[PDB]
A paper describes a structure:
The Lon protease is a AAA+ protein found in prokaryotes, archaea, and eukaryotic organelles.
Indeed, 3D reconstruction of the data revealed a substrate-bound hexameric form, which adopts a close-ring structure with the substrate-pore-loop contacts in a right-handed spiral-staircase-like arrangement. Previously, similar close-ring hexameric structures of Lon were only reported with the presence of substrate and ATP analogs. Here, our structural analysis shows that in the substrate-bound state, the sixth protomer Ac6* binds to the pentameric assembly and bridges Ob1 and Ob5 together to form a close-ring hexamer, in which the four substrate-engaged protomers are Ac4-Ob5-Ac6*-Ob1. In this structure, Ac4, Ob5, and Ac6* engage the substrate polypeptide by the pore-loop I (Tyr397) and II (Trp431) residues, but the lowermost Ob1 contacts the substrate by pore-loop I only. All of the substrate-binding loops in the proteolytic active sites adopt an active conformation, albeit not as ordered as in the inhibitor- or substrate-bound states with ATPγS. However, when the substrate is present, binding of the substrate to the exposed pore loops of pentamer may induce binding of pore loops of the sixth protomer to the engaged substrate polypeptide presented by pentamer and promote rapid formation of the closed-ring hexamer with stabilized substrate interaction.
Residue numbers in the entry:
A (entry chain E): 506 to 577
B (entry chain F): 218 to 505
C (entry chain D): 146 to 289
D (entry chain E): 218 to 433
E (entry chain A), F (entry chain B): 218 to 289
């Protein structure tokens, strides 16, 4: 799902997430049997990152931690 | 003797029909044909439309069966394919337009503005474009319906609204077998007929009241229409061809979150509006 | 045409407008215009528009008659030729159809099967057999 | 000599078809012969095809019967007729193909693997008569619909999806009765029209929510 | 010129065709739409009504589609 | 030509019938208008009945909508 949403947001190689933040994402934001509601949140991540990128572009790649989830 | 005259009258209508064919048909339908070959559904999709086109054309001129398929062909030709509005523009200009139409609504405004950020970041790329669905839940007093025009003016898009909810006719959502007397493609498709873009603004007013049970279930039909990826290949009962509904930007209106079927509820991008404050109330009263 | 070939020696624009306006080939509403127009120059001009549209209709109606008459012969000739070609094949098909089918039924009628059902089909079969064109009931009788 | 009479009559009727039946008769001699050559036509399906073939030669003059008859014949021309896809020989390759499309789903993956292993070991035609049928039950969030495309791509069998999301009157999913306009917007056979293989993988929107009318 | 020429031809052919059968048919409809020109509706539905009447101005008398097309 | 001759004979029989049966059918519609006259329905109901018989006469018979229209 993450590669697909990253490709759909066109900002490939600019945002990355750790394996610990995802645990919190599912355990605190979406509680459904499937993962259809998870793709909408994972694309919201890229959509909000694109808002920051458009006004100000950074260099390299950005790593998202469990404490940086509320911003995006 | 009466049969003779009737036959003389017939050729009279024929001569007239042939004259009309030289106008509405022939080169006119040839130009529309080549034009659709330019901006119509892909050829592998247009195949059904061609199927009906061949028979309706092969059918004797003026044949009702020819018109029975002629309406299908005209609906395919009129409905937009691979043609869209101008793409991402400056966010600074559109944010003022979105702010002046409605005070507050920070979440919806953020959603609308950030929808353009990805459109700008995917400039010139080769990735699938999918306009997210939108649902607004809140009391009826909240101006959710005016968003259909507010967002459209925000991105200069064309907008249409369909009064769904409180309906019991699946055939309304997915039209119906063209074989039945007359023909009516699903409402959605009727709404998008006049909007000549593949990414219109569609407002599903109060779909919460959607009533199912008896009769073909309108709601169950909207499952194929609102599938996030299968809408790229969408075959309703009328338009046999797989419609490309991916680019269409959807907005749905609801009043609560307890009267929606589960497949619909766990497929929407949920946006909630709990209600304006009294300071916001006095501000909007003063300004608008 | 008698009223036109008698005053051709006068070149008065008003007189020519009168000649081209009295022959009212249109509704009486237009005739009110010519009846009350203080512009002889425009008189012939507006009559020109009416007669020109009427002239379009003149040729148009003649063409319609020409199209209908030519189509009449083509439809008649086509009807005679096309009917014969089909009636020929349909005659063969009818024999290869119920005519062969009933034969198969006769083959199993060795048990003395009641032919009352056949006679009813024959009523349908004599009528459709004679009709070597169309007769969709023949197909339903065939399945019967 | 009588056989040559039969051939002469057949070529006469074919000639009339070709000369008059636009897109029906000349399309007959041009492509319908090859149609049986490519897809094939059951003799029972063909004998009636030939019986009605000489009956719709009324084009140019015009005949709705000829068109609706021709629509039926054209539908018969393309629907697969005992023509199967190249059967899979390496089920292990299919295993990786299916593992690169989804994660987990060890039950359905093994179910499909068993269904393919039995077919590869069918000695004597006694299993092909019973087509394996799978119904998938669970929450809508699980990826059931795309599983049809995944399985079909792994089988190398062309895929088609059928809209069972809403079906009210009868014949809305099955082929509509013939004799009418002759226009069918999709059907169970339609999927067969989409896939030129007699053995494709076909998935439906759902079964719990389908037929719901009074007439049918 | 072209528009008036096609309107007049449609009117005369409707007149003759409905004099031979069912005078108060598509001639009634063409008179009614000539009225709706003078009492014109929104432009969005004006063209829709014109297209709708044009397609049913070419079919045969008593068509099953015409049964509801005339009443609409 | 024999098919044409039997068509001649059948339309002979049709002549015999429409003399008695057909005229009764016309007399049926004439008596229907006599019914709409004798009852003395108000002007609006008169016009509705006239329009309804107008839409019925334009179309043919043997259709499902025709039964409902006839009874109503
Ligand atoms: N912030 C706002 N600015 C302007 N008008 C507002 C605002 N909030 C609510 N309204 C007004 O409130 C009304 C809500 O009606 P409507 O949008 O039809 O509600 P609903 O979407 O629930 O059916 C409209 O007149 C709308 O313009
Ligand atoms: N284990 C999985 N592997 C791959 N994709 C999965 C998995 N679980 C869920 N999905 C995704 O779930 C989605 C299901 O969408 P779709 O099949 O259209 O509808 P439904 O969820 O109703 O079956 C697909 O995008 C699919 O890739």
């Amino acid at each position: 799902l993450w590669p697909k949403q990253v490709r759909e947001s066109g900002m490939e190689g600019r945002i990355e997430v750790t394996d610990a933040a995802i645990l919190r994402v599912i355990s605190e934001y979406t509680r459904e049997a499937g993962v259809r509601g998870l793709e909408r949140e994972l694309g919201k991540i890229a959509r909000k990152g694109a808002k920051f990128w458009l006004e100000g572009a950074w260099e390299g790649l950005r790593t998202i931690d469990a404490s940086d989830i509320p911003t995006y | 003797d009466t049969n003779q005259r009737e036959y003389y009258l017939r050729e009279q209508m024929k001569a007239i029909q042939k004259e009309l064919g030289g106008e509405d048909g022939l080169s006119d339908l040839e130009a529309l044909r080549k034009k659709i070959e330019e901006v119509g559904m892909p050829e592998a999709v247009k195949t059904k439309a061609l199927k009906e086109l061949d028979r309706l054309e092969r059918m004797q001129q003026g044949s009702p069966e020819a018109t029975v398929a002629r309406t299908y062909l005209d609906w395919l030709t009129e409905v937009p394919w691979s043609k869209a509005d101008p793409e991402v523009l400056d966010i600074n200009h559109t944010r003022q337009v979105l702010d002046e139409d409605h005070y507050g609504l920070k979440d919806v405004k953020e959603r609308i503005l950030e929808y353009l950020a990805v459109r700008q970041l995917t400039q010139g790329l080769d990735v699938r474009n999918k306009a997210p669905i939108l649902v607004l839940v809140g009391p009826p007093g909240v101006g959710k319906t005016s968003l259909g025009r507010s967002i459209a003016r925000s991105m200069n898009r064309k907008f249409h609204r369909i009064s769904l909810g409180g309906v019991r006719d699946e055939a309304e959502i997915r039209g119906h077998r063209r074989t039945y007397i007359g023909a009516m493609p699903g409402k959605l498709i009727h709404a998008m007929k006049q909007v000549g873009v593949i990414n219109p603004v569609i407002l599903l007013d109060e779909i919460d009241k959607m009533s199912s049970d008896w009769r073909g279930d309108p709601a169950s039909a909207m499952l194929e229409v609102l599938d996030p990826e299968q809408n790229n290949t969408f075959t309703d009962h009328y338009l046999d061809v797989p419609y490309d509904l991916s680019k269409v930007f959807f907005i749905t209106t609801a009043n609560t979150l307890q009267t929606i079927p589960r497949p619909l509820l766990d497929r929407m991008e949920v946006i909630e509006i709990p209600g304006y404050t009294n300071m916001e109330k006095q501000a909007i009263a003063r300004q608008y | 045409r008698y009223q036109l070939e008698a005053v051709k020696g006068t070149s008065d624009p008003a007189m020519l407008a009168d000649t081209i306006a009295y022959h009212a080939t249109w509704t009486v509403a237009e005739k009110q215009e010519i009846l009350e127009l203080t512009d002889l120059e425009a008189r012939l001009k507006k009559v020109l528009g009416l007669l020109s549209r009427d002239l379009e209709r003149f040729e148009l109606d003649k063409r319609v008659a020409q199209r209908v008459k030519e189509q009449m012969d083509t439809n008649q000739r086509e009807y005679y030729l096309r009917e014969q070609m089909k009636a020929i094949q349909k005659e063969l098909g009818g024999e290869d159809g119920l005519s062969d089918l009933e034969a198969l039924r006769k083959k199993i009628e060795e048990v003395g099967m009641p032919e009352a059902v056949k006679t009813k089909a024959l009523k349908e079969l004599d009528r459709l057999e004679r009709m070597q064109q169309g007769s969709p009931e023949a197909t339903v009788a065939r399945t019967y």
